[PDB]
Symmetry: C3
Subunit: 358 residues, 3 copies
């Protein structure tokens, strides 16, 4: 029983911890919001999971973790100075874009490790994450649709294309479009790495190509909500099978470059923003297949500009599947105000169902 209580306390949103947090020093609240935003990249509103995510990021590369921390803290500060909202900043909804911006600006920088000047764009871009997010909200809230990772996409694409591979101050890695045909010898497929694509794929959401970091992220997801963990591994599996189907190079599948978009899409559609149902689960799997496929599409499109498909496919596929109108009630699109971790969304669906029956 002590265990049940404790698990209840560490699982979900940790609402009790949030209400306790609403009282202490503003700096400790900022730390809680930073951790919560770090965790919200995978649709998790949990501080302990955020600490676990930061442990994984530190495990992979310290410099990337430092940039991510700077990005999330300055995105939260910018949300505060712009008086965006409390309960959105407090829930970490203004921090995940910042941590992603920091991490993926560190990842794609050709300058090297511990290029301190890289903090200056990271300070800037993170502080622009709320602004753009608010803007997109004013467009998306008309359809009750989430902003998703759109600010990150827009801002990191701006950074990597305005800077490019050839600027003297903030170089980026060289991304070139495919020019020669690559032969895939199916006899050279390594099933060990092919199945490591699931942990690496779930870890690549945050820029990490390490299997252990992916396992740490899965542990965080499981502590938060098992439904998110299941949909995450299913999304990475559909991403790796879709990559196999579209003649993608095996190294890309091994490095999880075909999974992060799919894990995000499967988490979002399957439970997070649609009420969980077998119809909704099938819709989530279909959206994850579409997300991998459109991920290949966007990667090939944006390789011409020297950019990568960072999360664009997730945003596009999730919004497309979240906009569809259906004449069956079993595909229920939850209102944004009533969106929380998928288990609580399912409990809400049940309450609505019973009440309607009566």
């Amino acid at each position: 029983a002590n265990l049940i209580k404790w698990v209840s306390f560490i699982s979900g949103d940790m609402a009790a911890f949030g209400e306790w947090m609403k009282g202490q020093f503003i700096l400790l609240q900022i730390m809680d919001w930073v951790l919560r935003g770090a965790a919200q990249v995978m649709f998790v509103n949990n501080p302990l999971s955020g600490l676990i995510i930061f442990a994984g990021l530190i495990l992979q590369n310290r410099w990337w973790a430092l940039n991510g921390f700077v990005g999330t803290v300055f995105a939260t500060i910018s949300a505060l100075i712009l008086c965006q909202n409390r309960g959105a900043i407090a829930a970490g909804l203004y921090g995940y874009n910042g941590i992603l911006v920091g991490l993926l600006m560190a990842v794609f920088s050709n300058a090297g490790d511990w290029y301190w000047w890289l903090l200056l764009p990271n300070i800037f871009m993170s502080m622009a994450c709320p602004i753009v997010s608010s803007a997109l909200a004013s467009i998306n809230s008309r359809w009750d649709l989430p902003v998703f990772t759109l600010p990150f996409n827009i801002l990191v694409c701006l950074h990597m294309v305005a800077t490019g591979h050839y600027n003297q101050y903030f170089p980026q890695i060289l991304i070139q479009p495919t020019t020669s045909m690559s032969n895939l010898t199916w006899s050279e497929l390594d099933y060990a790495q092919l199945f490591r694509s699931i942990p690496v794929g779930i870890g690549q959401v945050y820029g990490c190509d390490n299997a252990w970091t992916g396992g740490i992220f899965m542990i965080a997801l499981f502590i938060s909500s098992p439904i998110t963990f299941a949909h995450a591994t299913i999304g990475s599996a559909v991403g790796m099978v879709s990559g196999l189907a579209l003649a993608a190079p095996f190294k890309n599948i091994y490095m999880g470059l075909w999974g992060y978009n799919c894990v995000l899409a499967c988490i979002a559609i399957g439970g997070m923003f649609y009420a969980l149902t077998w119809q909704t689960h099938l819709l989530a799997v279909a959206c994850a297949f579409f997300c991998a496929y459109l991920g290949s599409a966007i990667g090939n499109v944006m390789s011409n500009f020297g950019l990568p498909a960072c999360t664009w496919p997730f945003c596009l596929s999730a919004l497309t599947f979240l906009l569809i109108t259906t004449e069956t009630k079993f595909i229920h699109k939850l209102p944004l105000a009533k969106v929380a971790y998928p288990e609580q969304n399912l409990r809400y669906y049940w309450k609505m169902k019973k009440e309607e029956k009566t």
Copy 2:
């Protein structure tokens, strides 16, 4: 008199045939909806015209016709399983995207004829045509604007860029941007082919560069509605004159690559979605000129990605001309619920006019 009755029965939407169809077996209804969606690519809601279109497609290339049939039937099935709507699936509004996807995925595939594996994306993309269409509806219905061929554009562009010219499984033709200056010797203009551009242009809507297929399509349009036929030939004529004006290569004009967007735009604006009036006809001609011009623009833009301007210019130009606000009542934008073949739209306009006068 027997002839008048008969022509009435084969002309327009064949509403009597639709009400009779609402009774028979679901498979025969699926066949009717497949034919109707095949015909609706040129804004025609007619089953007999759809059979004529399939005859033309079989005349040009059997493999392309088979892919188009598979695409339209699976798009209709996907619309059914998603419970999209009846009267939209029954009117063929969920099938034209599928048939276009199949036809133009067959057309741009470098694998060859009777590459059976090509059906697998065609099965997938067609089944994704309703989803995307519904999504775009939720955005477009806010302005009472039609989805048009947007899902086709989005999905076939995704296919041709995610696959590309260099993948091992689903190769695409090589589309490269212009690099050297091409001299146009006006003395080498062939007026016979230059005027064959009209039938070939109207036939290119469906991917066919055959003059006879274009003539068959014109026959189908004439059986459906003469106004659509007139606006179709006018659109192809303005496309070929615009291509002459913009120094386009003569071979492109001969192959009808400058007409399909313009025929679609002229059909849509002139009568189909605007009440037919001399002001509306002039607006349709202007929109068709803009459609050819923006067709050159989109072709040059998307040649960098290795993609073609499939119907994007039609959608963009038609939506732009359908969004304009005007202080004169003679340019009347019909509500979507009251949209049918242009003659019935004109009869509705008259009823509204008389009623308003009284």
Copy 3:
């Protein structure tokens, strides 16, 4: 006192001159609207300032000035024939897109000076400026957001990409993406030109890289409204400092290629569409930094297509900063119907404030 009265008469919108203009011949009204639209490129609704702008344009290059005049007059005529509106055409809101289209189609044409055929697209594009503008209004008016220079962007990009550098009739200059790394020797910085970037930057809004033309434009802005002049020079300064920060080539900063977007953004956000406040001024400076930064981004993105970032960054940044929702009342987004020169906007803000207090 005679001076006060006179300055009042030449400053602002010249409302007295407008009411007097509402009476005379239609041709003289067309001339007034042409001048007013020429002036409105920098958010100035003043005829005398428009005459000053045309004097500057004639000073730089006669052919460009002639194309700009043709574009603005034909855009006004097209707005009239489409029955768009009076008070929008009369305020010049349908002419600035036309004059910009003419000027920048002259600027980027490789055909040469006095290529009379260039008028034919200029006639066409200008007449398409109202249509597209109306279309974008129907989308933008849902959020109470201005169209801005969007039609210009869309239409001149269509022209320069459909024509390209390699067409026989309407050649364009060659814009290639960066391929080799350029070293910036900070010891070669010329502070004289570096500070001339402000006049040249403010003059580049209209395509002019001449310092004297920029000074003439600043004189026009000062006669219209000092707040616009201050925000204009501040925007050009932030553009030139941002260009220095992002390792831009010094020649681009000298030619003012980093200022026009920023001057437009700073004018728009700081006073023109937001009520002027120190918070709004800081938001305008931030938006101008974002505008320069996204200007580099769009230039690098669209260099692949052979296009330049004409005003796109201004439109994107201004709309993004005009869409943000804030919980503080000090950032006030004025309704479009109540938008005029920034001093009158500030007077309106004060009236609203006092009335609310009581």
